[PDB]
């Protein structure tokens, strides 16, 4: 009964950073059980963590913005968070409003700002915002409050109002959960897993606009499923009949079978891979459902 969208990964949207999927790989040297909060969905359509339906919510947030100038810091924004559709954010059984960044580092954000300065009214201001892992900024998106700032010699004379912060760049990226509640624990989607012996997480990879003073290397970020798959399951609400789905990743024009894998019901894909180094795969294939299989189903190894 379960089917998947007939869309090549390279044409899909990334579920943790708003950009195209560029890579498909396994890498045993990376954390094998990441606790990502976006891009998390059960095959029966249940959204986990802070996963939104719309890809445009990924790594963004909406807020009632209040501004004030502080010497030595600049224009400071206090963001009282709302859900990105305008509805109120109520702290509950997840870490933050839907789509809130689930990684760490220093994030440049862009928001609509209105000024009272003559000859000026509307413009887009870039703010800096520390995400995590730990901070002295007391970020608490779980309680609906985060702080950002932009350097400025004097007040930008900003009008308080509603905003949607969209991500401009990352600085000092770390793929670990951010400060959701001033260091306190929050409700989290569990780490991705478990896996059988010899199984590894399939990673859909994009790259993040980056600030880096010394190194030009691109900043990779992975997710368990492209956003199209997230929305696909959330909408279809399939009936789950076992523990996992046997998928075949195949080239649609040649029929060449590239590899088989297991889409566990908890929303992650495993491949059987014994090597130690990374193994990248072509991104122009199509995932197709074979059948339901039990957790213990042993895959054919890759590479």
């Amino acid at each position: 009964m379960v089917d998947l969208p007939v869309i090549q990964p390279r044409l899909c949207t990334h579920a943790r950073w708003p950009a195209p999927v560029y890579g498909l790989l396994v890498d045993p040297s990376l954390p094998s059980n990441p606790q990502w909060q976006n891009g998390r969905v059960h095959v029966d359509g249940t959204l986990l963590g802070t996963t939104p339906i719309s890809g445009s919510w990924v790594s963004c947030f909406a807020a009632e913005a209040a501004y004030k100038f502080q010497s030595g810091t600049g224009e400071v924004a206090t963001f009282t968070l709302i859900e990105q559709d305008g509805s109120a954010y109520v702290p509950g059984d997840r870490a933050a409003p839907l789509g809130y960044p689930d990684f760490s580092g220093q994030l440049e954000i862009e928001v609509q700002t209105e000024t009272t300065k003559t000859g000026d009214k509307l413009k887009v201001t870039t703010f800096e915002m520390i995400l995590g892992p730990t901070t002295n900024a007391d970020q608490a998106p779980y309680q609906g409050r985060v702080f950002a700032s932009v350097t400025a010699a004097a007040s930008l004379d900003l009008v308080d109002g509603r905003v949607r912060a969209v991500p401009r760049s990352i600085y000092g990226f770390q793929d670990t959960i951010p400060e959701y509640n001033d260091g306190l624990l929050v409700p989290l989607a569990p780490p991705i897993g478990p896996f059988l012996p010899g199984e590894v997480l399939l990673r859909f990879r994009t790259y993040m606009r980056q600030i880096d003073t010394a190194d030009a290397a691109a900043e990779a970020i992975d997710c368990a499923l492209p956003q199209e798959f997230v929305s696909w399951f959330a909408s279809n609400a399939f009936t789950v009949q076992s523990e996992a789905l046997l998928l075949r990743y195949r080239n649609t024009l040649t029929g060449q079978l590239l590899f088989e894998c297991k889409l566990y019901n908890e929303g992650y894909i495993a491949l059987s891979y014994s090597g130690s180094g990374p193994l990248t795969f072509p991104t122009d294939g199509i995932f197709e459902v074979v059948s339901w299989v039990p957790r213990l189903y042993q895959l054919a190894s890759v590479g």
Binding site: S71, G72, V76, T78, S104, G105, I130, T135, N136, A137
Partner: protein, 113 residues
């Protein structure tokens, strides 16, 4: 002063020596905790020493901090310097939300001849 806290923009020390950083602040922040922070991004930096908002000297590993709440200066000392101590540091005043912070770049070199 106008900015909440200021200090030396850049300081240079040498292996096995020491250096001292004076973090000057405005009188309004007298009763706030002062601290010395390491690394970037700025507001995820590692706190190396922090006061209890008093004038008591605190020492942790090779770093000391003492708040002069009369002259409104908390002084930081890094002893027995190592090459790995070089990097970006921060004079800091703890408060709810965004802390006042001043960037101090620390260079470390070997003793020449």
């Amino acid at each position: 002063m106008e900015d909440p806290v200021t200090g030396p923009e850049e300081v240079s020390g040498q292996e096995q020596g020491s250096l001292t950083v004076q973090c000057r602040y405005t009188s309004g922040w007298k009763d706030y905790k002062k601290y010395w922070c390491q690394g970037v991004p700025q507001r995820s930096c590692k706190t190396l020493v922090e006061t209890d908002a008093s004038e008591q000297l605190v020492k942790k590993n090779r770093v000391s901090i003492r708040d002069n709440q009369r002259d409104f200066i908390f002084t930081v000392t890094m002893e027995d310097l190592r090459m790995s101590d070089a990097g970006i540091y921060w004079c800091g005043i703890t408060k709810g939300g965004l802390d006042p912070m001043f960037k101090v770049t620390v260079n470390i070199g070997p003793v020449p001849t």
